[PDB]
Amino acid sequence: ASLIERQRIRLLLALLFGACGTLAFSPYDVWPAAIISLMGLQALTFNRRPLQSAAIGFCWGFGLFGSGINWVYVSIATFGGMPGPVNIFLVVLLAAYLSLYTGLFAGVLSRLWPKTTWLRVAIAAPALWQVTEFLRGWVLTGFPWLQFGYSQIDGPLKGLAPIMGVEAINFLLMMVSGLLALALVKRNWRPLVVAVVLFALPFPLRYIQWFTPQPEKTIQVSMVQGDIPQSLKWDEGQLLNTLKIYYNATAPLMGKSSLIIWPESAITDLEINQQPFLKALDGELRDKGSSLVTGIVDARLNKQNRYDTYNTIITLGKGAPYSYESADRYNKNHLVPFGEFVPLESILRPLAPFFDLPMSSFSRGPYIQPPLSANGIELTAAIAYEIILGEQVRDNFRPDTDYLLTISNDAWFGKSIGPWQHFQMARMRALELARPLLRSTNNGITAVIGPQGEIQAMIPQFTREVLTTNVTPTTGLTPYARTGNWPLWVLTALFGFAAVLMSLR
Amino acid sequence: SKKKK
Ligand SMILES: *C(=O)[C@@H](CSC[C@@H](COC(=O)CCCCCCCCCCCCCCC)OC(=O)CCCCCCCCCCCCCCC)NC(=O)CCCCCCCCCCCCCCC
Numbered sequence: 001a002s003l004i005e006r007q008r009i010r011l012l013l014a015l016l017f018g019a020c021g022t023l024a025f026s027p028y029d030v031w032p033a034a035i036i037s038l039m040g041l042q043a044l045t046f047n048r049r050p051l052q053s054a055a056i057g058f059c060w061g062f063g064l065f066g067s068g069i070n071w072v073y074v075s076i077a078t079f080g081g082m083p084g085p086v087n088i089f090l091v092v093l094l095a096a097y098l099s100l101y102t103g104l105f106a107g108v109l110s111r112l113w114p115k116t117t118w119l120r121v122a123i124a125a126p127a128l129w130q131v132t133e134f135l136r137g138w139v140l141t142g143f144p145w146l147q148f149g150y151s152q153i154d155g156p157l158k159g160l161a162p163i164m165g166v167e168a169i170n171f172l173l174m175m176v177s178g179l180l181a182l183a184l185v186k187r188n189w190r191p192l193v194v195a196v197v198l199f200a201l202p203f204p205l206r207y208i209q210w211f212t213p214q215p216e217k218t219i220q221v222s223m224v225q226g227d228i229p230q231s232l233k234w235d236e237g238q239l240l241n242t243l244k245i246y247y248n249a250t251a252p253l254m255g256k257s258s259l260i261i262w263p264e265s266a267i268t269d270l271e272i273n274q275q276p277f278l279k280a281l282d283g284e285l286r287d288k289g290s291s292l293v294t295g296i297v298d299a300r301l302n303k304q305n306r307y308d309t310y311n312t313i314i315t316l317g318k319g320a321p322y323s324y325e326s327a328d329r330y331n332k333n334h335l336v337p338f339g340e341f342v343p344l345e346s347i348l349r350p351l352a353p354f355f356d357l358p359m360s361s362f363s364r365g366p367y368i369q370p371p372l373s374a375n376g377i378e379l380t381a382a383i384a385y386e387i388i389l390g391e392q393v394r395d396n397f398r399p400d401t402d403y404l405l406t407i408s409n410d411a412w413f414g415k416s417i418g419p420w421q422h423f424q425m426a427r428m429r430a431l432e433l434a435r436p437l438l439r440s441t442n443n444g445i446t447a448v449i450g451p452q453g454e455i456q457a458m459i460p461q462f463t464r465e466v467l468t469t470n471v472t473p474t475t476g477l478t479p480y481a482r483t484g485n486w487p488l489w490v491l492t493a494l495f496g497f498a499a500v501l502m503s504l505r
Numbered sequence: 506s507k508k509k510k
Contacts, residue, residue, distance in 0.1 A: 230507075233507070234507055234508075234509045234510055236510070264506065265506055265507070268510060269510065270510075297506075297508065309508065311506050332506070335506075336506065339506065339507075340506050340508070358508070360508050360509070361508075362506065362508060383506075384506065409506060409507070412507075
């Protein structure tokens with residue numbers, strides 16, 4: 001009663017509920033925290049002015065992104081070259097920027113739907129939540145991180161992912177949490193029962209498998225985890241050791257593992273320079289009957305006589321003879337902001353000094369690329385950050401795909417919660433597309449994810465070892481793979497258009 | 506990823 005109508009307490013209480021949402025992700029795996037966090041956001045924005053609701057939404061977002069993506073400081077501080085106070089400011093700015101979309105969501109929600117009714121929390125908010133979440137994941141190439149849909153990878157709503165996708169799970173979570181907040185505030189059991197029923201409906205969907213496994217095509221897949229130090233990785237002198245470490249770890253695996261995978265950019269030197277190594281290595285693999293899929297950095301000429309530096313996945317060995325001018329390669333398309341390219345580079349150039357802005361930039365590969373071929377196996381590649389973009393992976397996905405391929409380098413963030421959150425989003429792609437995921441990392445979570453988003457084999461982080469295990473390919477198309485996000489956007493359009501049309505009266 | 510060399 002007292003000091004709860006006040007915004008100060010209501011603003012401070014939004015940080016706690018925002019920060020409570022970070023407990024729903026991989027390092028902690030508490031999916032009830034996602035419901036409680038969203039329930040707090042819905043309830044705290046009740047009976048507030050549109051500007052006051054935006055402040056609550058911003059502070060809720062600042063709590064979520066002030067503790068959910070605070071691991072970015074580790075990458076910034078370890079190798080940033082910037083003063084300590086400067087590093088702290090950048091992480092705060094990232095949390096503040098991503099909190100604008102949450103602040104925008106709450107500000108718009110209270111403006112058009114001021115009264116606290118079932119329309120606002122069940123029809124209006126989930127439709128508006130996806131629009132604001134889309135903008136967060138689209139503006140300036142986006143950053144679709146800390147989405148509550150990924151928290152249900154092992155939860156009871158995992159069955160809805162292969163049908164509509166991850167963006168529908170957090171759409172449903174907003175419905176359930178909004179109804180729970182409506183029930184709690186107004187002391188009404190009707191929003192509580194409807195929230196329970198809507199949450200319990202997708203439970204039997206998790207026992208439906210859209211894939212038929214293929215026992216006759218079982219292979220042994222070995223993924224080498226180099227554990228190359230990030231600081232010494234891109235150096236002249238560590239190149240010879242890095243090649244020897246991977247080559248000596250891979251040599252015993254030839255002739256026994258049909259598919260061998262190296263982490264992202266395992267070969268640091270340019271592909272045009274490391275030709276004798278790749279040609280000789282391809283000969284060894286083909287003779288013994290194995291294929292290698294390794295990440296590398298390639299600089300290609302073009303029509304205008306320039307160089308386009310790509311983050312490439314080259315394939316060698318049986319079933320894919322190596323050639324510089326070949327088609328069995330994957331160039332990374334969605335570059336990491338400020339890590340591989342500088343957004344607004346024409347505007348941020350004056351501020352590039354005293355900001356550690358990278359002078360060079362990778363070239364973006366085509367949005368749609370053919371699946372990789374290696375020993376008669378189709379792989380849908382997705383380099384590191386691209387494994388969190390469910391729509392892009394689905395577009396590159398094909399019916400002939402056997403496994404989903406992902407190579408990453410999470411050594412920047414060290415011992416933090418970031419690699420796990422990245423790993424959790426990778427598991428959702430396997431669940432959505434019903435294909436096994438072959439994830440290899442320099443020192444991160446190198447694991448084989450099953451067709452239902454289940455960890456089959458995994459190795460501890462920060463170690464130099466190989467993950468040799470048998471994986472069975474799956475065939476069959478999920479409803480998500482057939483349709484995509486458009487069935488959800490129609491639901492968002494139907495909910496959004498109806499909510500606005502109700503607000504127009 | 507990190508470019509440079
Ligand atoms: C390889 O495959 C990696 C990519 S590299 C990952 C690593 C690299 O780290 C470094 O190289 C160390 C230096 C990092 C760059 C610092 C540059 C700072 C420049 C100024 C920034 C502020 C500009 C505006 C004010 C003047 O780590 C990183 O890349 C760290 C990235 C840090 C980003 C800092 C953002 C600062 C706040 C910006 C707020 C918005 C401003 C809008 C203005 C209109 N990748 C992988 O292997 C996979 C990694 C997955 C996790 C990726 C984690 C980082 C995500 C960054 C998202 C930024 C979104 C920006 C808005 C769309």
